[PDB]
């Protein structure tokens, strides 16, 4: 106070920060508190049902919140908000019960070491439940929808096989605002809603996370909205670690804003989830280790880009992050379906065996781009052209074997431009060729060999088949 | 438990046993590093509270322990007969005001499997402090570290033995490249799901203890360059400033060497190729040395060698292959000295050579490389 003295907090909002306990605005005295059992229920409306403020070393077994009245939640005998706590480093839950309607349980700033084993909470079904609007919970999080788990502003309680029901966001977890301080950690989690109802199960923000799966869990019903994951504004340095077994069922695994990738799925078992399910976007997955697949499959007709993509029965549609995909997973091979896949800005390909029915375009003056040593094949396509630019432009000083087995049609450019001092082979099989130079370099000389087997192509060049900036290793024409 | 010398001590038999949710703290740090352990193995001899000690062969799991004020948080050492002994411990939550501590995890000849939360630190003492201590930890052992590390830069590992025994997996560094410090990269056994684009080297402001692997932290030695690449996957190596050499044989990742420093072998010594690939030098102030061979290659993989700098092995060769090897040579610009661009020691090697630049030793260029190599190609 003021004058100097204390008082007891009576405020319902209030929770002291570790700020609060050092600068001596805040004084706990909450210390060898005990609870084995103890059963809770609240009036309809109530707002909290526990205020776990200050309780650091306090411990808890078998605390039961809320009461299951009827079907009615609005009538139930359960707190809008279970318990909330902050300031009780070194706290344990113990099987922890919660019943709710807003906000199953909340924990603020200094818990260092705590630990919430084996919770098991949830709503009183989910009827109306994506109407609830959490009440305490971290700016960064405007969502609207009832949460069973929140955590913010650097607390990092371990949470241990928890039991969450009935709820459109399992977690909402925010780092802390400074430093992105607060690792986001569940293990083991067993989630479930009926009708199959959820937004979201991890909704992080600006932070880090490790989460084993069981092989428990599900998305939402909205096929453009929901995902497991939403990573909201995670810095660059973060990591949203994925380890365990996917839900058997089809779900959508991540959606996100911000500039920078986080996701890693360390040796995740995805089941079948590249045939049944979906990666959502692409663009959050920073890694991937120990989960394989032999093709990429694109269909710019029928495709979705929500799709994995390393399934048959589930193509993406563009070719706007085939090598980022093909890199993560390790494809051998690219499958184009019917149609023209195109470009319309440069685009990176992998170094693979492409394959299929389909074309390849290069529009708007658009190149493809090689950035890695290996061997690029077009086998059986039905052609590559450009309206204008150079088909191949690349980057890398490492060895570059572009082999085509299809129709290609560089018009007035060239097959393949090095903007580098390169080394390339190139060979052309059957089908035809059309270009100016088959290689160019934009300097300081590109060493390439080269074989074009085919009666269809610019005969003109036959005595110098390269730009001036290209020395040739050997010449297989005629 | 609030200890003054040792908070807990596990010593032989304990087979299942566990320790879950401990909290165990030195009342204050006070003194805490004159501390001499009472019950401890023959192997840890360093002066220090120690909050948990184990050895023996005793292998109880430590499941969520907060650790706090100690100079060691835990010491354990492996069975002395077979290594026999899994050191265990899920997400410590590990504190100490004023930064004070000398290890947290001080493993003598044993494996571990450790999961970090995010939270922890490394000492004062810029030398001698880390969070891992590997002391003869055998050849067979491995010491994994999972989750994720702590916010604040720390050192994070130094030893004794000559096994590296470290494991990065899919380890959260978070900004430890950028603020922290690897401490000794001999220890590091492997990594996965841990990556980098460019290592950093500085010759003159680097220092050793760094990662390299961020521009604002290089590295000053050659010495491990090679090791560096291969875990992190690093696609180019940055030279500063000045003058990078070695005095004994020394390997070269195969990725892209850039930046104003050149590099030199002295004492005769050579640089070493041991994987295939394409090694490039480009505008580099150059790559010479005093005597021996240029390049070593030891690997029948095709091997590119890529210069775009100065060249000059003065009386000795480019590249000098060791094996049957494969090779593609290609000068580009600035100059080239040498008395033959590419030898082998016996057996045939084949060879691809291209060479622009007027600069380079002209009376080769119609016998270009000793007797056991045969030319693919030849372009001057
Ligand atoms: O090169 C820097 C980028 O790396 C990308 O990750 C790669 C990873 O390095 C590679 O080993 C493989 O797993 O493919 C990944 C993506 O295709 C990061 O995603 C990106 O953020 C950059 O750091
Ligand atoms: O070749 C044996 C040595 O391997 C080194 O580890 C390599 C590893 O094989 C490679 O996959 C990547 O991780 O680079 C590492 C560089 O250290 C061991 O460190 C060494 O002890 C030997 O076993």
Redesign the interface.
Known sequence: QPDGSYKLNKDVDYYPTGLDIDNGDAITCARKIDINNLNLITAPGVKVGVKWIGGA?CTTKGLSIGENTGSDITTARLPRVGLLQSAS??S?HENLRILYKTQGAVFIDSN??A?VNNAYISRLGNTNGELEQAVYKPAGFTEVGDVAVTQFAGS?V?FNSPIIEQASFDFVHAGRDT?????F?VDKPHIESSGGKKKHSFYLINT?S?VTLSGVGLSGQDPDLDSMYFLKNCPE???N?VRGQMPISGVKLVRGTGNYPTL?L?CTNMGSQFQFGEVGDIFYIK?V?GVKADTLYIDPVNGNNYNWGTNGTKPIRELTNIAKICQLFRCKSVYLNAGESVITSNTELPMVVFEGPGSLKANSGSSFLIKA?GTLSLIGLSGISTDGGHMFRVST???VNIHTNCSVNAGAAYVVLSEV?G?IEYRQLFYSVNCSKYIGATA??T?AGIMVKTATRPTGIDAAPVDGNV?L??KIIE
């Open positions: 070393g480093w070194g344990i260092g070491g630990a990092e371990k430093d992105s301080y607060g690792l950690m880090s490790n340095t973060a990591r670690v890693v360390d890694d280790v040593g000083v490492e060895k001092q080394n300081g000389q060493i020395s290793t050997y």
